[PDB]
Design a protein around this nucleic acid. Structure first.
Lengths: 205, 169, 27, 59, 219
RNA sequence: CAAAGUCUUUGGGUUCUGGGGGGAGUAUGGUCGCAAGGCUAAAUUAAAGGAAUUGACGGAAGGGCACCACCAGGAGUGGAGCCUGCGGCACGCGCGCUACACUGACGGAGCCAGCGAGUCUAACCUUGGCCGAGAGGUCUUGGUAAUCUUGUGAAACUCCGUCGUGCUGGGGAUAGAGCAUUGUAAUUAUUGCUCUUCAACGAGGAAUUCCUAGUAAGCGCAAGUCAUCAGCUUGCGUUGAUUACGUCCCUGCCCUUUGUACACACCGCCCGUCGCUAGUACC
């Protein structure tokens, strides 16, 4: 459901066809298109903002869509999949072409840089990778499995060193400078990676 | 000798004249196949406890008083079900949603609150232009009112023709 | 041509056969 | 199947004929094979042997 | 009543179908796949070469299509044709004998391509109703009452004969003319799986070699 | 149920009745019943109604869609010889295969696939040895098979060399002679091998086919799994590209011309002909 902040009301409550859960969401910067993603369906539903119909069911993922984001400069939406492949959609204007980039582990974190030219990911191996969009190749990746603090729960039976609960990152957001990433997951710690120098800056418990 | 299968049919003009004269029968009658879209108290014998004076009082004095209490029990039970069902399904600890007369104050106030209620309604939604009550005038959807007496007959024609195609649609 | 004869007569000599049989059984 | 019909034209007078075998499988004879003058392709219902003798009933 | 495979979609969602060709097609039949691509609406033609039938099926259930149309040929004359509904739906291998391609005739123009009415004649058998409900769902649902092209599927003498027609209605009679292909057509086997599967359960199979093979109809 | 009883099948006196219901169909010279008449005579098409239904046609302007359109290419087919289908009865047409060569041919040499099939009451897929220029022969073997054939050591391809632009060493039709194989049977050549013969064809008129990525084209291999197939079909893999993804300018097709949906914003009367109905006056 979209909301107004001048009037505090729904515009329209966008729904699917067969009543699917929606995890995540992506909004066209020129506010025409709202895209959402599931765990049930793994099809990227696409609503228009004016007509509450779904325009299209963008599909092609094995496994669910974790996150969805749109780069403001190029108006391109990049899907997140559990199939270890990152697919960049291009949905505007007679093109309808999807470019797919393979990833080593389930990607549960997707970050779009302000530039509109880079995409920051958070896979399940811990590692955060930074891809280009106009090319399929990657600029670099930064390694996050070591500098994550993990708790031992009370009911646990394993050491905190070798549990695989929390050593990935279930979020990422680029700074608006485009030079730093803050990541945070189901762990105890938050990070501040530098993007060119590829080294974390400070770790926050 | 005897053949082992039906011979392939030979398309004469006699076959087609049997065929295209079938199609004219099903077009003109318009009975043909196509994939249509999918669209979208009992009296109680048991003695009434309430007396005649009492039943009149009820008439003298939500959907139903018994049915709402059925609805209120059954949603209190479902939220108990989602908690236990939710806890097993969830991989993380979840607190119980609920734990189930004087003035009641809402803990959280919805909307702006300081902003007036009238502001939320749009201007368009408190005055649509409408067709005038008099027969002698016609008001259009944009606010260009037209009387029936200042029209020309060629403008009388187009407006009846315009209200033809909108009504027909 | 002989296919269209051998088929058509054999169909007649079965379509005349069940009639002549069922006329026996009911009587 | 060889040496049942002499010419490739003789087969064409007989195509579509319900051929049977000793073993009891049915079939039809379909096209006159060209490059030898006599033979023809015939589709049976199951795999004919080499040891087997096709017979076409006729009157 | 519609078939159990087609029951969930039946009127709701439009079909999207794929016409694809056998393997290194002759230039006659590569034309002829385009008349199949034009005879249906929502039909795209993907040229096949060095695809396997698994990874063309499995990369089609993924992308989501209703069914798959694959053709075969003998020396330019197309002979066979299969329609196979994808979400574990049935398939129907058709043999088609008398073809007249549209590119032979004249440069009369190009087809209407609008949603067709249909005509199903002489389908009495319960297996005949299977062929009804497996052919009918290859067209977009709910045609207009006055659309101008109508596609007849006629079943005189166990050979389903399909023609493409346009019609206009005169002051007294309907007058029609023919565009598009002439077929004779004959189904000969009907699997319950897709055309990938090759060991699915056989609902129907044309028995040739039987003492009463020529006798019955829809047998 | 005080009889509807009279300790396991019964005898106190007497009168009377039955020899099996209830719903139904039927044949029937077996027996009783049962009737009318014999002169008396209408006449492809309207008005209207029923059903069906916003009355129909045309223009203008705006917009959508497409290898039936625009726009840009690869490989060709048609010109040659054969193969094949269609006509015709010397020929017309359709699908195709071959090569015209130096991005080649020829000789060595380097050596890499995938899908597949395979023997019982019999003769299958066949290593290995031996013999034969070869084709093939032969003595053996493994395999009813992720087991043996088989790493199917496939072909293009790669390298080194010979040829040198000559219908040349390009091309292999037509043909002579011999040796093998399958088969009861090879003449009108089944096919294979060996030597000789060495044609057209110097990139193919007007026409016109297929195709957007592991694809087009080149290239060889396995199988013929109740139809269609045999120098063919259905498949498979190896080598691996040029070019296109825009626009409605044209040719078509289609949609719209109440904004109705709810904000804000923008827009802010589509047009004509004929019917239709109503009234007024004229003949």
């Amino acid at each position: 459901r979209a909301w107004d902040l001048i009037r505090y009301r729904n515009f329209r409550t966008f729904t699917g066809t067969e009543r699917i859960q929606f995890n995540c969401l992506a909004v066209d910067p020129s506010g025409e298109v709202v895209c959402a993603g599931s765990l049930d369906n793994f099809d990227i539903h696409v609503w228009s903002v004016q007509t509450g119909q779904l325009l299209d069911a963008l599909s092609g993922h094995e496994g669910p869509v974790s996150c969805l984001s749109f780069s403001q400069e190029n108006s391109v939406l990049a899907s997140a999949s559990w199939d270890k492949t990152i697919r960049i959609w291009s949905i505007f204007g007679r093109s309808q072409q999807v470019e797919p980039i393979e990833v080593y582990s389930d990607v549960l974190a997707l970050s779009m840089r302000p530039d509109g030219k880079e995409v920051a990911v958070s896979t399940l191996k811990g590692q955060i990778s930074i891809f280009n969009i106009e090319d399929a190749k990657q600029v670099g990746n930064i390694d996050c499995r070591k500098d994550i603090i993990s708790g031992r729960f009370n009911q646990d039976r394993f050491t905190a060193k070798n549990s695989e609960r929390s050593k990935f990152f279930t979020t990422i957001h680029y700074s608006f400078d485009g030079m730093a990433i803050v990541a945070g997951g189901n762990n105890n710690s938050i990070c501040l990676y530098d993007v060119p120098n590829e080294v974390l800056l400070k770790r926050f418990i | 000798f005897d053949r082992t299968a039906k011979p392939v049919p030979v398309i004469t003009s006699e076959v087609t004249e049997s065929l295209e004269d079938m199609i004219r029968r099903r077009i003109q009658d318009s009975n043909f196949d196509d994939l249509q879209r999918r669209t979208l108290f009992e009296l109680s014998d048991v003695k009434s406890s309430k007396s005649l004076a009492e039943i009149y009082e009820d008439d003298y004095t939500a959907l139903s008083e018994e049915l709402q209490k059925a609805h209120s029990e059954i949603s209190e039970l479902y939220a108990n079900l989602v908690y236990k069902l939710d806890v097993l399904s969830s991989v993380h600890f979840v607190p119980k949603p609920a734990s189930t007369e004087t003035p009641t104050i809402s803990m959280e106030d919805a909307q702006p609150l300081y902003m007036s209620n009238a502001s939320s309604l749009a201007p368009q939604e408190i005055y649509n232009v409408g067709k005038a009550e008099k027969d002698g005038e016609i008001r259009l959807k944009n606010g260009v009112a037209m009387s029936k007496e200042e029209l020309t007959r060629e403008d009388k024609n187009r407006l009846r023709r315009a209200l033809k195609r909108k009504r027909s649609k | 041509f002989e296919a269209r004869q051998r088929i058509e007569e054999k169909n007649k000599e079965s379509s005349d056969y069940h009639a002549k049989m069922a006329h026996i059984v009911n009587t | 199947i060889k040496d049942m019909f002499s010419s490739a034209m003789e087969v064409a007078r007989f195509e579509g004929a319900q051929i049977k075998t000793v073993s009891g499988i049915r079939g039809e004879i379909k096209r006159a094979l060209s490059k030898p003058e006599g033979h023809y392709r015939a589709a049976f219902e199951d795999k004919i042997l080499m040891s087997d003798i096709v017979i076409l009933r006729s009157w | 009543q519609v078939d159990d495979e087609y029951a969930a979609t039946s009127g709701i969602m439009d079909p999207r179908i794929i016409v694809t060709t056998s393997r290194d097609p002759s230039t006659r039949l590569s034309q002829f796949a385009k008349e199949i691509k034009l005879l249906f609406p929502n039909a795209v033609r993907l040229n096949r070469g060095n695809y396997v039938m698994p990874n063309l099926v499995d990369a089609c259930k993924k992308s989501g299509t209703t069914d798959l149309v694959v053709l075969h040929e003998h020396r330019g004359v197309p002979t066979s044709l299969t329609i196979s509904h994808f979400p574990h739906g049935p398939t129907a291998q058709f043999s088609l004998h008398n073809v007249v391609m549209r590119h032979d005739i004249i440069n009369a123009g190009n087809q209407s391509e609008v949603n067709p009415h249909l005509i199903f004649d002489n389908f009495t058998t319960a297996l005949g109703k299977r062929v009804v409900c497996i052919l009918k769902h290859l067209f977009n649902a709910g045609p207009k009452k006055d659309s101008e092209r109508v596609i007849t599927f006629a079943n005189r003498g166990d050979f389903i004969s399909v023609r493409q027609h346009v019609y206009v209605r005169t002051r007294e009679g309907v007058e029609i003319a023919e565009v598009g292909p002439r077929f004779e057509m004959r189904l000969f086997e009907l699997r319950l799986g897709t055309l990938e599967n090759k060991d699915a359960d056989v609902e129907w199979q044309l028995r040739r070699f039987i003492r009463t093979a020529n006798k019955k109809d829809y047998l």
